Design a protein around this ligand. Sequence first.
Ligand code: FAD
Ligand code: CDP
Ligand code: MN
Ligand code: MN
Length: 554
Amino acid sequence: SSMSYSWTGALITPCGPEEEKLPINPLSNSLLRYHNKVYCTTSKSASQRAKKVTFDRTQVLDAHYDSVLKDIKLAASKVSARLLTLQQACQLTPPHSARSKYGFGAKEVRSLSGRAVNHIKSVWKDLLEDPQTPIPTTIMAKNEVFCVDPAKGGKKPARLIVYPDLGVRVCEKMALYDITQKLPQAVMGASYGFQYSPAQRVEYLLKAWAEKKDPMGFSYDTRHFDSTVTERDIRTEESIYQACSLPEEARTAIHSLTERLYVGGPMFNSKGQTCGYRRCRASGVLTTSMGNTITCYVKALAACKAAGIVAPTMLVCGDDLIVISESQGTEEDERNLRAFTEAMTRYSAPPGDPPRPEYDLELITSCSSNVSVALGPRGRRRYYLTRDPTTPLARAAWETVRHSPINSWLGNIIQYAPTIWVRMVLMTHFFSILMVQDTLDQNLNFEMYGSVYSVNPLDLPAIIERLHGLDAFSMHTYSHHELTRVASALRKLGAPPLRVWKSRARAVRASLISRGGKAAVCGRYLFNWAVKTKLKLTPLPEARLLDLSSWFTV
Ligand SMILES: Cc1cc2nc3c(=O)[nH]c(=O)nc-3n(C[C@H](O)[C@H](O)[C@H](O)COP(=O)(O)OP(=O)(O)OC[C@H]3O[C@@H](n4cnc5c(N)ncnc54)[C@H](O)[C@@H]3O)c2cc1C
Ligand SMILES: Nc1ccn([C@@H]2O[C@H](COP(=O)(O)OP(=O)(O)O)[C@@H](O)[C@H]2O)c(=O)n1
Ligand SMILES: [Mn+2]
Ligand SMILES: [Mn+2]
């Protein structure tokens, strides 16, 4: 049937400046040496990604899909959702959100400036009066940092991002924000990812594994997921939304947004030249994350029925997917997974790498993370969530006139506190830098799922205990897999071995213990691993006061 994109041949031009690296990276050049391997994706590679995501889609559904969609619309029916006030949608736009063509930006929108509320009023009225005229969109290449992989063809091309004008984006939040806060949870229940903190997600998968008599799990990621969603997928999304109890005014704007924006439309480059036509998901609309996860859940759930997966348990984060199920014998389990893949290829959610049955929780990698195990001095098994540290290290090295890696470090220290690589590398380099800057007690921004939370470095012990528990300061023996990987990534980026980090840490700890106060608590908790006569860590009362609920949610 339809083509994901078509192109006029106009270039995908840069939105602002794409910065050169500098000849000295003074904050991260004592972290790793091979700064030549750290690169940022750029609009240069945008045509390359363009050719990789343009393809003819052929969707073929069936009674399994049809059965799922029916039950998911019924779950949807139990949701009641309201319009947001224009004023509320305004106050939800980020403080740096891309300006409007109509001469005003995030600052006026957040401050309810009259100019802005006026234009946005008339944009809302156009949505309610006009259900057909396509809404134009800007296409830009995403800039993100990676390490090179010669085994994966040098550098990844930039991801394609496609978003409507700032006026339209506020309007989306009025029509759809409340649903984005209620629908996913309701139709997916505990299967919704994006409601679990790292430890909660380990808890969940651990539980799923043990419920099964003979457990078996696999993970799935659709290849170029935004380009695989078809105009029918998007219209089916509208009907899942319309399944809820909504005011009539919202249904009207929801329908207009779907027909005029979500099912597709013309894309213009940043220079204003008309650039192509889009017939798939624009990664940029409000519903990007919700549509990804619900359309992924429905297809994946259908495919489970097609493949005869027994007693499935799912975890769905966008297009990343984990399924813990009852094993039917390894021979059947392989056949079933080909069936699952053939099904989802029929649903137009074809895979990146072919999925594969695994019978060991550490061998299932999804959401770029995996569960792993460490002992204590206890001998007791502590389970946690880790990842390949390559990309975290690469972004620990991204350092230009306009970006500081220091937020990147904090973010990983918070999210992966129990990992050997956070504990021995990032935590050490973090506090070492801040002390030399005399910055320990000056706040940083932690960033996750759009929200930005303020964090004081000297609070990391309490924060980490509230998130991961006191076991995060006691992991004695890490797994052969984890040791191998962290070792290899450190070699790959020219960072010191773990041996050397242990020495550095001993010194860091000594140095902030002897600042007393909150700084010393940091050294006794965060660096208990570096001294041979470990002190007995006690729970921290201030952790009992922290409420980190909304940190790892949506
Ligand atoms: C709803 C949502 C909104 C986000 N908004 C921002 C933002 O405004 N500014 C910012 O700097 N980072 C944003 N991010 C990125 C986010 O903060 C994490 O960095 C990201 O999820 C990578 O963490 P991960 O463990 O899930 O790794 P990953 O394996 O990279 O993510 C797993 C899945 O989450 C989804 N996803 C990944 N990145 C994004 C993304 N940028 N936007 C939407 N979905 C994504 C995808 O479906 C992906 O398959 C957002 C992520 C989500 C899920
Ligand atoms: N920076 C990002 C990353 C992913 N996503 C969404 O998540 C989907 C799948 O995530 P992904 O990491 O597997 O990237 P793809 O190569 O599948 O496009 C995208 O296709 C996007 O719709 C986004 O909106 N912004
Ligand atoms: Mn994908
Ligand atoms: Mn993915």
